[PDB]
Design a protein around this ligand. Structure first.
Ligand SMILES: [Mg+2]
Ligand SMILES: [Mg+2]
Lengths: 111, 253
RNA sequence: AAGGUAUGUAUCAAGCUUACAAGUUAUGUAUUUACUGACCU
RNA sequence: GUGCUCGCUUCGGCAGCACAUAUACUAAAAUUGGAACGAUACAGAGAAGAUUAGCAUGGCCCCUGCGCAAGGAUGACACGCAAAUUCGUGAAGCG
RNA sequence: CGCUUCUCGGCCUUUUGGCUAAGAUCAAGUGUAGUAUCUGUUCAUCAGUUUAAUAUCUGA
């Protein structure tokens, strides 16, 4: 198997985050017949993250309170990861540890 | 080239469905549509193979089992349908539908002690009311004084429902069972709610003992009245208790 | 060194492989939008 | 086959000693299946306007690479299944 | 006859799936002579004017 090198760091965090929220909603919902219309809680999760980055409030009406507050704790987890990477390699591209262009043009946007 | 186009149609749909199952091995729509597609060819020993390797990926869904069994039961292969019903019910006990359809299949066949054995296995897991009085309904629709007596004392130990206490009082309303029906009423009267009655047992016991004569009917509603619920009854029935006792007796002047 | 001159199919030999198992018409206008004339440095 | 011992009588004949079972047997094949590349002709090119950086996920798809790097068009290949809402049928049970 | 559950069908979101820095950027037309078409818009009785016939003026 293959390690998670620096080019698939961001493409692995989403993978394990949505695996975790997948088998959290798989073990959290009660004995109803359908789970999430096969994907829909994940769509609410990614929409919650897009509204977090854009600071739109994301008040979706009529959502069950366990899934809406698990989406809130997972997007606070991802926002912690995102801004704590923004601080970190902003300081690295300040003193000049890296010259990576993807990192510079990305941390202008993440700031 | 009709054989060529026919085998082309079959090979292209098989290649399509095998690539569809090979992409997603978890969604089971592919196996049931592929297996019933070969069932549409009406002579198969491979749709059995499609279902029997379709439960390697997920045996815990009821849809695959009941659809494979209604496929095998839809055709004359009765021995195979029974021979997969028993592994369905031993593998997945707690799902009611497999037990129901397997009993129903053997009802449409002979009513052999196989069917009763299926039923008593189904009793053995302690199910709900819905199944138990379905089995007593089975014993009534084959007119069993003996066997519906046999399988219904083991009933009441697990469901002490008042709706079921009053329907263990059923040998009265079918056989009249005189002395041992009075013993069924003894069994009704001594158990839970000794001073609190669950406000309902003695209504139906009064209905039968009023359907009976004035043997010992004065006692239970009026003179075994130590066991009250704060008024002995609501307002809904005590004048109805009085006119219930009035006009169905010797009526002495 | 890769990062650019795509890849994916269908027929046609050496490379490699064993040398084996084997018997509602309509106007006036404000007003766009379309359209015409091989119109035009 | 050999060498040695008159060892038993002719150098010659004999006796004993020491030495003790190789090989995918072929220079062939009646031989064998022949996939890659190149040619031939088609198909043609990710992201709801256009030009497009990518990184992933899945496995009966692989190539280059010493690879637990990396690149192979994001390496390719990934499509209509609506479910629950209305209604028909049929079953199980109850009143 | 009524009531609850189960299964089959008649069916009313299904877009190519996910993630990055909304992934990233972009997107010039004239002048002339004429037409067609929307939108906006409004539509009391003579006498002569005029018109194929009709519809302005003036008259009481
Ligand atoms: Mg790819
Ligand atoms: Mg790659």
């Amino acid at each position: 198997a293959k390690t998670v090198t620096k080019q698939r760091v961001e493409s692995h965090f989403d993978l394990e985050l949505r695996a975790a929220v997948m088998h959290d909603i798989l073990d959290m919902m009660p004995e109803g017949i359908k789970q999430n219309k096969a994907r829909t809680i994940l769509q609410h999760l990614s929409e919650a993250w897009r509204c977090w980055k854009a600071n739109i409030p994301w008040k979706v009406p009529g959502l069950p309170t366990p899934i809406e507050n698990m989406i809130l704790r997972y997007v606070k987890a991802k926002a912690d990861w995102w801004t704590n990477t923004a601080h970190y390699n902003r300081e690295r591209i300040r003193r000049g540890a890296t010259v990576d262009k993807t990192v510079c043009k990305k941390n202008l946007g993440r700031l | 080239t009709d054989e060529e186009e026919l085998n082309d149609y079959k090979l292209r749909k098989r290649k399509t469905f095998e690539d569809n199952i090979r992409k997603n091995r978890t969604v089971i729509s592919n196996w049931i549509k592929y297996a019933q597609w070969e069932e549409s060819l009406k002579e198969i020993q491979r749709a059995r193979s499609i279902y029997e390797r379709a439960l390697d990926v997920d045996y815990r869904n009821i849809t695959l089992w009941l659809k494979y069994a209604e496929m095998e039961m839809k055709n004359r292969q009765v021995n195979h349908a029974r021979n997969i019903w028993d592994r369905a019910i031993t593998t997945l006990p707690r799902v009611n539908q497999f037990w129901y359809k397997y009993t129903y299949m053997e009802e449409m066949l002979g009513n052999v002690a196989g069917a009763r054995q299926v039923f008593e296995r189904w009793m053995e897991w302690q199910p709900e009311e819905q199944a138990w009085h379905s089995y007593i309904n089975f014993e009534l629709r084959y007119k069993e004084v003996d066997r519906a007596r046999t399988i219904y004392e083991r009933f009441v130990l697990v469901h002490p429902d008042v709706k079921n206490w009053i329907k263990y009082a059923r040998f009265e309303e079918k056989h009249a069972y005189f002395a041992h029906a009075r013993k069924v009423y003894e069994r009704a009267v001594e158990f839970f709610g000794d001073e609190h009655m669950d406000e309902h047992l003695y209504v139906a016991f009064a209905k039968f003992e009023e359907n009976q004569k004035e043997f010992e009917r004065v006692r239970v509603i009026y003179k075994y009245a130590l066991d009250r619920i704060s008024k002995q009854d609501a307002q809904e029935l005590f004048k109805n208790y009085t006119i219930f006792e009035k006009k169905f007796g010797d009526r002495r002047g």
